[PDB]
Amino acid sequence: TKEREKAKSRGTFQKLREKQQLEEDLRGYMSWITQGEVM
Amino acid sequence: QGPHMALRKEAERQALAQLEKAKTKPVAFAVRTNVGYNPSPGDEVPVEGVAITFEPKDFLHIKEKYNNDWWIGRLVKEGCEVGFIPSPVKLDSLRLLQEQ
Amino acid sequence: VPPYDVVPSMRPIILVGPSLKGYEVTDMMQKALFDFLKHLFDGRISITRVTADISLARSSLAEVQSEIERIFELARTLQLVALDADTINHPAQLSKTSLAPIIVYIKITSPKVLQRLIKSRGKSQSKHLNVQIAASEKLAQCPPEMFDIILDENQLEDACEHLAEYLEAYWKATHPPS
Numbered sequence: 001t002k003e004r005e006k007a008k009s010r011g012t013f014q015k016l017r018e019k020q021q022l023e024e025d026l027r028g029y030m031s032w033i034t035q036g037e038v039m
Numbered sequence: 040q041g042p043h044m045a046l047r048k049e050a051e052r053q054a055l056a057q058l059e060k061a062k063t064k065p066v067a068f069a070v071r072t073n074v075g076y077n078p079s080p081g082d083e084v085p086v087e088g089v090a091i092t093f094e095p096k097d098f099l100h101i102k103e104k105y106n107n108d109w110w111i112g113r114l115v116k117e118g119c120e121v122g123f124i125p126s127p128v129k130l131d132s133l134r135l136l137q138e139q
Numbered sequence: 140v141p142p143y144d145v146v147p148s149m150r151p152i153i154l155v156g157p158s159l160k161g162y163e164v165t166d167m168m169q170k171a172l173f174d175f176l177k178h179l180f181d182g183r184i185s186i187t188r189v190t191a192d193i194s195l196a197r198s199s200l201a202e203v204q205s206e207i208e209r210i211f212e213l214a215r216t217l218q219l220v221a222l223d224a225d226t227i228n229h230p231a232q233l234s235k236t237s238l239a240p241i242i243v244y245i246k247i248t249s250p251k252v253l254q255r256l257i258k259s260r261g262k263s264q265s266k267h268l269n270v271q272i273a274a275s276e277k278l279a280q281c282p283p284e285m286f287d288i289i290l291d292e293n294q295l296e297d298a299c300e301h302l303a304e305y306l307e308a309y310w311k312a313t314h315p316p317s
Contacts, residue, residue: 022252024293025247025252025293026252026255026256028295029168029252029256030256030259031294032167032171032294032295032298033163033164033168033256033259035171036167036168036171037167039171039174
């Protein structure tokens, strides 16, 4: 019942899943950079 | 009659002739259209129902010139086949006739 | 208003974005795509550098015209044609030519991601951050219909597959069964 009182931060997971989407692209595009250099 | 339907049914045979023969020919050139076209009966297509249809900004591959009014080619699109394309003078003539 | 404009028998592929050409992020990301196509379409493709400023249809009029004629000739036998065109950063740049390109937008959805990518190249590239960020924002404001293909996939292999699927379908559209 203590933890039901912190479930109201639903707008903060909306910021979180954007950031892990930003970490998803940034590693991926950098491999896009990486496998163009050694070719 | 079948006085007349000797020539104007031998013309249709001679047109379908060239059309099958252009199927194997190379592309002479391509055009991007600035106008649309869909054949009406009064357009007098060398083989009825064998005119191609297109919208503005479509691409056409032209194989050969059938006569002054019609080219032979295809819409650049999967499934689309060879047919008759109205020449610029034929397009102009259809508009002018329509106005008259 | 003539009803028909003569264009190449195969529309030349041109890459724009994710920012300005002549900087590392864009040049290297596009380079990986050119190298993929070279093998993916081997035997059916030519990929050629265009240094002359073909948006002018600087480079003289004759130099531009001869590059334009060369691109038409490359497409005459219905092989895929891909241009590495240094000066072309925006689709509106070729709109007044009769090249009729297939315009491929290599799109980075997040400006923050593009900024981080530029910074990853070192301060020599990060010096030019703003001009690259401004250019990417301009592409992002274009209506999507200005582009023939939009590659917004974050993995090279997914972007390549999307572009290859599009060009394979274009191959079919230009090569009807006998």
